[PDB]
Amino acid sequence: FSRSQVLELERRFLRQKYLASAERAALAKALRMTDAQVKTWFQNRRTKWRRQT
């Protein structure tokens, strides 16, 4: 993803570690991503979070 896309995903993750289905769809539209891309990103980000804390 672009630098900006990643930063915006990180901004949301800091606030909410899990999103609802509707929230992922809204964020996908806002960040120019597919719903599945947002879902996968957050799964992988949670794995990083678990590893690092």
Q: Which residues bind Na ion (CB under 5 A)?
A: 18-19, 42
Residue nearer to Na ion on the CB measure, 33 or 42: 42
Residue nearer to Na ion on the CB measure, 28 or 42: 42
For 10, 41, 49, 51, the CA distances from 38, given in Å and listed in that order, are 11, 5, 16, 20
The owner of tokens 């900006």 is 4
Shortest Cβ distance from residue 2 to Na ion (Å)? Answer: 20
Residue nearer to Na ion on the CB measure, 18 or 49: 18
- Coil, strand or helix at 2: coil
